[PDB]
Every structure is written in structure tokens, then in C-alpha cells.
Design a protein around this ligand. Structure first.
Ligand code: NA
Length: 254
């Protein structure tokens, strides 16, 4: 049993081809730890057009980070086909888990699967952000000056035989689920061009669960971190151009 890293730097990417496009998959490797390979909706975005390079995608990295490179989440307008299949935008996102491309077009919420095996009890998610909403908010068949907001949260839950992963419905249901143990959700979400610290405490008291120390050691608990430039971009309410930069993210554990 090796733990994933708990400190995330956003330095590293590999380039992956799909549908005549290429995009980045971010990963974090540390000595004595299992490499975390982040997921995002980038493969879903690859379906909506051709000739995209990594920096056209909703999820990429920037060299203008606080320490070195940083996460760059930019909500994107989709290519011709996206609209016609009801995918007018694609939120700049990053999460722990996986992206099911079989669901990207029919059920966006199901496509983003959240979780990886975690042996610790997390207490807080700390990191730094910058955020600027895009100028036109897409909602319904309309483009408005509604001010887009971003989301940051983390999940800690108990696995069961028929519940191995959660998905995007968790953020549409007040973070409620029968397997849920703790959740950390950002509340202050203001725009800024200055690196701004966040510190989200995990709330175990809201769910009233009892941790099994054995099952925790046996790998029966998953954690996830989910980041998005557009809070409601999962249901295609968001602004193209909405940019969330994240750097020096750490899952502080017990
Ligand atoms: Na960094």
C-alpha cells in the first residue's frame, strides 16, 4: 500500500492524442509514493473538434505560477459539434478519479468520476488561486453578463461493493450521499489577479459517520479533489474565458 502524494505542484504534463487533437494529462510523482495521474474533461473536449493543441484545452498548465508552473483552468466554447449535442461549453476542470468518454456526450455529470484509494483522514485542503470570470455567461440559449463563479471542493468517502466511485451529481446534491464521510467546500469565490490562499476544513460532523481503522488501512476509503473554473459548467452554465489558476495545493491529513 503506497499513498498518492498529498502536495500538488502542477509542474508535470504528458501529451495525449485523441480525435486528431493533442492535450495534457497532469501528474504528480514523489519518491516513495504512487504517482497521481489527474483527470479532467479534456478527452470530452477532444470530441467537439479537430486541430486543438494542448493550450486550446479547458485544462492545461501555465508557466506563470506562484512557485513554477501552475494549473490553468479555462472554460471553453466547444467546436461546431458540441452545441448540436447539447455541449455548448466545457468547464476548465481537474479532479482525482477518471473520465468516462462513453458518457461525455450523453451524461456529463456521470462522465466525471471522483475518487482514488486513500489511507489517511484528510482535515484540510489548502492552496492558492487567481480567478477572472469570462465576459459572456452561457445559460440556456442566451449569452449574458452574469458573473461566473468557480468551484473548489474535496470528498472523503467509504467504499461499498456497489459504490466504488462517486461522480458529478455530488455537487448538485448539496454534497450528500450515503457513502459520504467528509467534505470540504469553498465559500469565498471572489475574482482576483493576486495569488489568494484558501483553507477548507473537512466537515466530518455533518455526515455523522464512524471511521473503520481496519477498512481505512485495507484501502476501503476514497478521496477526491475537484477544481472547476465554472461552478455550473457541469450543466453548461458558464462563461467561456473564465480562468481559474491554482498552485501549491496540499491535502493536509491527520
Ligand atoms: Na507549481
Amino acid at each position: 500500500t503506497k499513498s498518492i502524494p498529498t502536495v500538488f505542484n502542477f509542474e508535470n504534463v504528458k501529451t495525449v492524442p485523441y480525435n486528431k487533437n493533442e492535450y495534457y494529462v497532469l501528474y504528480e510523482a514523489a519518491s516513495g509514493y504512487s504517482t497521481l495521474t489527474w483527470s479532467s474533461g479534456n478527452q470530452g473536449f477532444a470530441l467537439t473538434g479537430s486541430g486543438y493543441t494542448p493550450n486550446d484545452f479547458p485544462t492545461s498548465i501555465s508557466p506563470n505560477g506562484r512557485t513554477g508552473n501552475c494549473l490553468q483552468l479555462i472554460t471553453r466554447k466547444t467546436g461546431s459539434l458540441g452545441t448540436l449535442v447539447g455541449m455548448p461549453i466545457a468547464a476548465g476542470n481537474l479532479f482525482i478519479g477518471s473520465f468516462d468518454i462513453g458518457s461525455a456526450m450523453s451524461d456529463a455529470l456521470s462522465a466525471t468520476k471522483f475518487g482514488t484509494t486513500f489511507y489517511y483522514e484528510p482535515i484540510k485542503l489548502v492552496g492558492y488561486y487567481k480567478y477572472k470570470a469570462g465576459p459572456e455567461f452561457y445559460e440556456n440559449g442566451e449569452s449574458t453578463n452574469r458573473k461566473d463563479v468557480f468551484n473548489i471542493y474535496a470528498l472523503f468517502y467509504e467504499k461499498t461493493k456497489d459504490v466504488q466511485m462517486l461522480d458529478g451529481h455530488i455537487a448538485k446534491n448539496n454534497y450528500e450521499h450515503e457513502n459520504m464521510v467528509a467534505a470540504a467546500v469553498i465559500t469565498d469565490t471572489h475574482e482576483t489577479s493576486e495569488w489568494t490562499r484558501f483553507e477548507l476544513d473537512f466537515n466530518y460532523e455533518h455526515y455523522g459517520k464512524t471511521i473503520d481503522p481496519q477498512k481505512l488501512a485495507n484501502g476501503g476509503y476514497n478521496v477526491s479533489i475537484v477544481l472547476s473554473a465554472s461552478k455550473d459548467g457541469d450543466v453548461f452554465q458558464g462563461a467561456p474565458g473564465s480562468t481559474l489558476l491554482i498552485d501549491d495545493l496540499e491535502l493536509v491529513c491527520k
